Amino acid sequence: SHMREIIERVKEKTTIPVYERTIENVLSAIQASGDVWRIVDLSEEPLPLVVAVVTALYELGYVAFENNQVILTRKGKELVEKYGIGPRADYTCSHCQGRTVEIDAFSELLEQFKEITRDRPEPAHQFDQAYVTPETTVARVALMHSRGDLENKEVFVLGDDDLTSVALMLSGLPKRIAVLDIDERLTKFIEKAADEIGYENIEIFTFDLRKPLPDYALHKFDTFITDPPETVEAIRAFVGRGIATLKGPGCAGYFGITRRESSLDKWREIQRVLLNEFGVVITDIIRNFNEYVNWGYVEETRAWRLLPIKVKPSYNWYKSYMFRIQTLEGSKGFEDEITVGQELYDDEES
Amino acid sequence: SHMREIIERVKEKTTIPVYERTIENVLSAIQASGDVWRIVDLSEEPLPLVVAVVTALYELGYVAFENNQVILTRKGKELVEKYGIGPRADYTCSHCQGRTVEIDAFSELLEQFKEITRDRPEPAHQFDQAYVTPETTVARVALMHSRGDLENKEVFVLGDDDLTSVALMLSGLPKRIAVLDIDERLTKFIEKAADEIGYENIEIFTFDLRKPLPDYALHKFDTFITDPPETVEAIRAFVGRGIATLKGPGCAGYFGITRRESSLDKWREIQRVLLNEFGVVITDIIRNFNEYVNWGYVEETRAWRLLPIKVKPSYNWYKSYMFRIQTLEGSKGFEDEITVGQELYDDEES
Numbered sequence: 001s002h003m004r005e006i007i008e009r010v011k012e013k014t015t016i017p018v019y020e021r022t023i024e025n026v027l028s029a030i031q032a033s034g035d036v037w038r039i040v041d042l043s044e045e046p047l048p049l050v051v052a053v054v055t056a057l058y059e060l061g062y063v064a065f066e067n068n069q070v071i072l073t074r075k076g077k078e079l080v081e082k083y084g085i086g087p088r089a090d091y092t093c094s095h096c097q098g099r100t101v102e103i104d105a106f107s108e109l110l111e112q113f114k115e116i117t118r119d120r121p122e123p124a125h126q127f128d129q130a131y132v133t134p135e136t137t138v139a140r141v142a143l144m145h146s147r148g149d150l151e152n153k154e155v156f157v158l159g160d161d162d163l164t165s166v167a168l169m170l171s172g173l174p175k176r177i178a179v180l181d182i183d184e185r186l187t188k189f190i191e192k193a194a195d196e197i198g199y200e201n202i203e204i205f206t207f208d209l210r211k212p213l214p215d216y217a218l219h220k221f222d223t224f225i226t227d228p229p230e231t232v233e234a235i236r237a238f239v240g241r242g243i244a245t246l247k248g249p250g251c252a253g254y255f256g257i258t259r260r261e262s263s264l265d266k267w268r269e270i271q272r273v274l275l276n277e278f279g280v281v282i283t284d285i286i287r288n289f290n291e292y293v294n295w296g297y298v299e300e301t302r303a304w305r306l307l308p309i310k311v312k313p314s315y316n317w318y319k320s321y322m323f324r325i326q327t328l329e330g331s332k333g334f335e336d337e338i339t340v341g342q343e344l345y346d347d348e349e350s
Numbered sequence: 351s352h353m354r355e356i357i358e359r360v361k362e363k364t365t366i367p368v369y370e371r372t373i374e375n376v377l378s379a380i381q382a383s384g385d386v387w388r389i390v391d392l393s394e395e396p397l398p399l400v401v402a403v404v405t406a407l408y409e410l411g412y413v414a415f416e417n418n419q420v421i422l423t424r425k426g427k428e429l430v431e432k433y434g435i436g437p438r439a440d441y442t443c444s445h446c447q448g449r450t451v452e453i454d455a456f457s458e459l460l461e462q463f464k465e466i467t468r469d470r471p472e473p474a475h476q477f478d479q480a481y482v483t484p485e486t487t488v489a490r491v492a493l494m495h496s497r498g499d500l501e502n503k504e505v506f507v508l509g510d511d512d513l514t515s516v517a518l519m520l521s522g523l524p525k526r527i528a529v530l531d532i533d534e535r536l537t538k539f540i541e542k543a544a545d546e547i548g549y550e551n552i553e554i555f556t557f558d559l560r561k562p563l564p565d566y567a568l569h570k571f572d573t574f575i576t577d578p579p580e581t582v583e584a585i586r587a588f589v590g591r592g593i594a595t596l597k598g599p600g601c602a603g604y605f606g607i608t609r610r611e612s613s614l615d616k617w618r619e620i621q622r623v624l625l626n627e628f629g630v631v632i633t634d635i636i637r638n639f640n641e642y643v644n645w646g647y648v649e650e651t652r653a654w655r656l657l658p659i660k661v662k663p664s665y666n667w668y669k670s671y672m673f674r675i676q677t678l679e680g681s682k683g684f685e686d687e688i689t690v691g692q693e694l695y696d697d698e699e700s
């Protein structure tokens with residue numbers, strides 16, 4: 001009863017749920033790659049859970065670390081063989097990078113975005129607070145336009161590390177754009193890009209999000225976009241605040257949810273929030289739509305700290321799914337005070 | 351108050367919910383195409399609802415029918431300018447048709463599936479009883495394998511007009527495949543294909559789906575795939591039964607849901623069944639992944655019957671979204687006897 005032993009070992013190391021499928025996913029990934037960052041990517045299990053699993057595996061003799069790779073031992077090869085776990089294949093589409101949309105027609109926008117963002121603020125120095133690639137940004141415009149959520153729409157951008165607002169301005173599509181960010185380096189940069197483009201229908205909000213929305217944000221938008229912190233409670237706050245900015249039925253929201261930091265037991269809870277507390281409908285969930293830029297900022301992670309391989313990731317391993325929602329009769333957002341501080345941003349899953 | 355008048359007119363014609371966004375979707379579609387089947391495709395509103403809308407628009411002076419095309423009158427154009435409604439754009443990826451998966455690595459499977467099915471049972475002559483293209487079918491295999499849900503897995507195929515089991519047999523991936531279908535022309539053909547391929551791990555079930563699952567199907571599979579009829583009650587039944595065939599947490603379901611026949615209010619109800627009745631998580635929702643073959647079998651539709659345009663579709667206009675779900679701790683299917691009748695394949699959404 002090999003698998004049962006592995007499961008119990010991993011459970012000693014985390015409170016995140018552990019299933020056989022968990023082990024299997026990791027095992028499958030390992031056979032495809034020895035790179036820890038890719039293992040996390042391919043397994044689509046949360047980072048701390050992969051670290052727990054890999055640790056449990058090593059402890060029990062199933063894996064080794066050799067020439068800086070994570071690898072199956074003789075005993076490991078027997079294990080995957082016994083359970084019929086093959087290496088994880090992938091067929092992500094090479095032109096759209098799995099995004100479902102192609103950006104050929106936004107070639108000029110892409111280029112103008114890369115140029116204008118030459119000296120954008122540098123990212124915060126954590127792997128999970130990076131901004132998305134330019135291609136992601138432009139692919140988001142493409143998506144949102146193709147669903148009819150941009151042209152002559154009033155669009156609210158809640159947090160804009162990504163500089164989605166800049167893209168939106170270069171698109172010429174919206175009627176107006178509001179951005180909420182207290183990062184004054186961001187909002188200043190956004191202003192400058194606006195002045196440079198001559199775009200007049202942009203506004204900067206700086207209210208406290210923990211506080212009820214002001215009357216100039218409440219029910220005043222057609223579409224919002226946000227990237228919430230990966231906790232249920234932050235998703236409720238950020239997405240629910242986004243929903244509360246919407247006018248009424250027929251409006252759209254876009255946001256990112258990761259497999260890197262949120263287990264599928266957490267995803268279930270997030271989905272029940274959206275469908276029961278808010279009463280909206282999820283119209284799209286697109287795997288790895290969002291690709292985050294990698295600067296090697298992983299040195300605080302347990303993966304870096306406590307595992308013997310100390311190789312930085314060599315590609316944009318950190319990706320999130322695009323969720324699209326739409327409002328309907330009886331939909332609602334989250335309008336209460338957000339009464340938890342920095343604890344909003346972490347949970348039991350690290 | 352133009353818009354409010356149109357909404358009222360449309361509500362006289364249907365019990366499906368009607369929003370300003372509904373009208374907008376349609377109007378947006380009309381400016382992109384005059385082909386009624388394309389209008390339904392681009393608007394992503396259900397067929398009868400689009401009919402209602404077009405009819406209302408026509409009655410109120412905003413649309414006309416000319417050269418077999420649905421077009422805007424002068425008064426219509428003034429309507430869309432006033433409300434800022436532009437033509438619907440689309441950026442679906444050319445290479446993968448939006449599926450997120452490319453099938454170049456499956457060129458041999460594709461060729462073999464087309465050859466082996468040259469003489470397949472001809473479709474039922476209902477636009478919505480069609481089977482999917484070969485490319486759809488191969489793209490499903492790629493998708494399901496990329497998530498680790500095929501290789502040495504036991505796969506339950508509930509209804510198989512699409513002949514997925516045949517693709518799956520040619521792929522060589524699963525440990526075993528069971529198909530439930532009472533259309534003996536199909537199951538016979540599946541047997542013929544299995545014998546021709548030499549595949550021995552295929553089984554045909556024919557039990558009554560309304561009756562509780564037998565002990566040889568209950569909790570015996572790793573993955574199921576089904577295309578349910580589109581009513582809340584039928585998705586509860588078909589998807590729920592598929593879930594009751596799975597072993598436990600960590601198992602996968604794949605099925606199709608359309609925008610053609612199910613309003614987004616309906617999708618909300620559907621996802622509440624999945625998240626609250628079954629306790630499953632939706633890991634992917636990919637628009638138009640499934641493309642159905644068109645043979646012009648639309649003569650029963652209101653669209654055909656009552657509009658002055660009488661052109662048959664010139665392309666594969668009928669498409670559904672791919673949902674993937676995964677089981678988790680506390681997940682459950684639908685194990686009860688179904689007492690409701692054919693009443694299950696019919697809803698007020700026509």
Ligand SMILES: [Fe+3]
Pocket residue numbers: 093094095096097098099100443444445446447448449450451
């Ligand atoms: Fe593609």
